[model samples]
Target: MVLSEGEWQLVLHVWAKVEADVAGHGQDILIRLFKSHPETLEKFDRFKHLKTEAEMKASEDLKKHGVTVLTALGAILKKKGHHEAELKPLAQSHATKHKIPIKYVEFISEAIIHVLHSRHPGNFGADAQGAMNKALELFRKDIAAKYKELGYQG
Candidate 1:
């Protein structure tokens, strides 16, 4: 359940390529998720009314929220699993305030993986993909564990 040193390097290398444009990449990740799971949009009040891809893309609110999420992802990568302070409250809020299920985190992680691949097919080889998969899987597990610790059934 740990990423090796090489795995860390592989994952970060690709992330460095996209972190520069976190806003656009993050929005693209959300757009990909919404396209796959349109029902998820109902959970976000600001994004709920955006029925079309064009509208979603044009929404500055979506972009800002997307940047927030992407920045969180960057922080997670930088901390490399020693980020309990970030995950605990984030997981708690999702359970208590947002009512977001852990499955959506998996969905968003998948969306990020897809975006990474599409954004840089040249750099995202099998090794990088494996690293990212392991990294995000751990992230998801940590969030799920925190949710379980909170006795959050939702």
Candidate 2:
């Protein structure tokens, strides 16, 4: 799944816009994730009680999660692209501290993919989707592996 420089450019170019006003897009992405998978809310102790759109809208915790947790997507991209540092310990922390199963990380990326598709109905095609999937898969693999090593055999 080697992305040509141009292919990578395509995805990253689109990503630039998404990350520009990061919180705006991230809020939508998280909302869509919850709408698509209500069960996801149960994993978040603070967010579990929120059901309606109104509740989600007013949630300080949701806003914080979008900025803090969702912002990690940008950081994860850097960790892989630059290879300047590491992410194993960070991945394991989610598994142990946050009670998040590593597989759910893919759900977050898929939610982003879904957002992109919805935002650009005519332009964001399967090829673009493939690029997004590949770009994020490396990080997801790291997360899953580190999580398993933390004794989460599932």
Candidate 3:
């Protein structure tokens, strides 16, 4: 699914807000996301248990990692705008290396954003669209850099 710049921006805004919030807030955001977008629960079953101590612990761990990554990316984008030049190549490399369709990368990113914003409407505002776009672009750059560091060429 191709995302319009507006749609991507919506996702980015939500991502930045969610990441900037406290860890508990982040986890609450994720819980709300799965409640609204139940299908996502299936995608990350290892981290989506509402029952069982182990599952809850695992979910918290995943949320922590997510918070860390998003917080870092948000900080970067807050300082810089959309770095498309840095992102496009990363998308290409990931698509090539994973043999996954390039669209899946964008799709998943947007999906996560949708869930976040949908669950926390007040977290984003009209002015956030632009900031969101820059955030997503920066996130893509960060992801690509990590892949490159791992010696994964797409």
> Order of candidates by lDDT, top first?
1, 2, 3
Span of ten consecutive residues with least summed lDDT in model 1: 145-154
Q: Which candidate is the best by lDDT?
A: 1
Provide the global lDDT of candidate 1 against the true structure.
Answer: 0.87
Give the least accurate 10-residue stretch of model 3, judged by summed lDDT.
97-106
Per-candidate TM equals: 0.96, 0.84, 0.43
Comparing 1 and 3 by lDDT, which wins?
1
What's the residue-level lDDT of 125 in candidate 3? 58
> On a 0 to 1 TM-score scale, where does candidate 2 land against the true structure?
0.84
Off by over 4 Å in 2: 1-4, 79-86, 121-123
Candidate achieving the largest TM-score: 1
Total residue pair clashes for candidate 3? 1
**Candidate 3 lDDT tens digits, 43-125:** 55456456543454456576785566455445544434545454555455554553433234445556555655565668665
Model 2, residue 132: distance off in Å is 0.4
Query: Per-candidate RMSD vs. true structure?
Result: 1.0, 2.3, 7.1
Query: What tens digits encode model 1's per-residue C-alpha lDDT throughout 1-154?
Result: 7888899998888989898898999889999999987778889987788879999899999999999988888998888768889887788888888888888888888898898999899889898899999999998888888888888845
